[PDB]
């Protein structure tokens, strides 16, 4: 059983997940709306920098009301940034264990530091990145954290993938790889590991131990 | 002005694409998201977009001859192709501020065990195509990868809507027993850029050793 709050000022965003990545009762996720958390008239999130700079921060105070009512001492808060420690899937393994994940989403040019700093006297805390671009805020990448996630939680139970192929044997005048019509299992093995073992010195050369 | 067509077989997981379009840019005829359902061209009563693998293995995958018929109607020979797969190319933010300038994107979206590789390497005979990975994790199908592309390169294109960064910081000055940095508000802006370059600095040795 694992239950996901992710926090937003764009709920709507979040629909995506709505039709199961749930149906189950494995999880359960709920999307929850930062203005909730506001007092004033204008529901104002966000303020200029101190120090200079583009743009506007989003204030530590309704961040801090928000989270108060949802984390526990239990709870992982996750925070997606582009200058995050690297979310692999070494992490989704790790997270399809735990009970309860709070996901903060940012919009502007950020959240106040202090929003993470605070919440790590009472919780653990993980800034993350999903990938070296630059998104407008952190809901998109809550949607990919939730399925890498989700798909690894008992009960919804290197090198790069090779080609595959299904049928007709010939289309367009393209053949699929005779050997995989051969029915033989040890020449099919092997053709594979050589087709994966070649897509990755191309594509992702740095998971061999090579340059760029 | 740029068109993106979407092909899946989830269009509403695209919905949050469409929702995030201001329509000032929409009415000045600056960008044109499209999504569809690959279901439209399948060819018999059961709809069928999968098959078994040849050679063996788990799961399926998907029909040459469903995506080609999608692919003959949608593309022209100016469009990209893109092709999410945990086998890609990475996609970063080069590859993003490239993308930006395109006329036409076409996002193939996969699931089960992914498409069957004559589909792209017929497109390539005829149109640019894209295998990319947006990180190093697995998702279920290409459509939240489908969603971080658009977003990620849509961002770059005007009005359409090294080093890690450090913290940033709004009002109150004092918050929950923690101060904002006092070089931030000391007027002294060579000392502040300073600053600053030393937490980027220290931030991507402790979170990103190999930028460096
Ligand atoms: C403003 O709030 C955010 C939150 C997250 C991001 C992000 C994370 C990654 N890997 N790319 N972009 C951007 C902005
Ligand atoms: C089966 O169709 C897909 C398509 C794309 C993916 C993917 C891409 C990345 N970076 N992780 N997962 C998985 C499955």
Redesign the interface.
């Given at each position: 059983s694992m239950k996901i709050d992710v926090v937003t000022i764009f709920p709507?965003?979040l629909?995506?997940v709505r039709?199961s990545?749930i149906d189950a009762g494995l999880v359960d996720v709920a999307v929850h709306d930062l203005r909730r958390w506001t007092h004033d008239v204008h529901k104002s999130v966000?303020?200029?920098?101190?120090?200079?700079?583009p743009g506007?921060?989003?204030?530590?105070?309704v961040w801090?009301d928000a989270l108060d009512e949802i984390c526990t001492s239990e709870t992982l808060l996750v925070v997606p940034t582009?200058?995050?420690?690297?979310?692999?899937?070494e992490?989704?393994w790790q997270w399809s264990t735990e009970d309860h994940l709070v996901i903060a989403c940012g919009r502007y040019?950020?959240?106040?530091?202090?929003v993470a700093?605070?919440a790590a006297t009472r919780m653990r805390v993980r800034?993350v990145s999903?990938?070296?671009?630059?998104?407008?805020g952190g809901?998109?990448?809550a949607?990919?954290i939730i399925?890498?996630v989700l798909?690894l939680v008992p009960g919804v139970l290197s090198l790069?993938?090779?080609?595959?192929?299904?049928?007709?044997?010939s289309?367009?005048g393209?053949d699929?790889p005779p050997?995989?019509?051969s029915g033989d299992?040890a020449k099919?093995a092997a053709w594979?590991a050589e087709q994966s073992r070649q897509?990755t010195i191309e594509?992702?050369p740095d998971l061999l131990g090579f340059d760029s």
């Amino acid at each position: 059983s694992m239950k996901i709050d992710v926090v937003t000022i764009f709920p709507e965003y979040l629909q995506p997940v709505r039709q199961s990545l749930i149906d189950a009762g494995l999880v359960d996720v709920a999307v929850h709306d930062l203005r909730r958390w506001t007092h004033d008239v204008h529901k104002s999130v966000d303020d200029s920098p101190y120090g200079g700079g583009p743009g506007m921060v989003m204030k530590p105070t309704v961040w801090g009301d928000a989270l108060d009512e949802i984390c526990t001492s239990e709870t992982l808060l996750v925070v997606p940034t582009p200058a995050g420690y690297p979310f692999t899937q070494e992490t989704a393994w790790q997270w399809s264990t735990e009970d309860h994940l709070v996901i903060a989403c940012g919009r502007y040019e950020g959240i106040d530091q202090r929003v993470a700093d605070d919440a790590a006297t009472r919780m653990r805390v993980r800034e993350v990145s999903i990938g070296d671009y630059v998104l407008n805020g952190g809901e998109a990448a809550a949607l990919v954290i939730i399925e890498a996630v989700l798909r690894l939680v008992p009960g919804v139970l290197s090198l790069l993938e090779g080609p595959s192929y299904t049928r007709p044997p010939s289309w367009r005048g393209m053949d699929v790889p005779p050997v995989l019509l051969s029915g033989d299992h040890a020449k099919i093995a092997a053709w594979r590991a050589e087709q994966s073992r070649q897509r990755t010195i191309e594509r992702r050369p740095d998971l061999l131990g090579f340059d760029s």
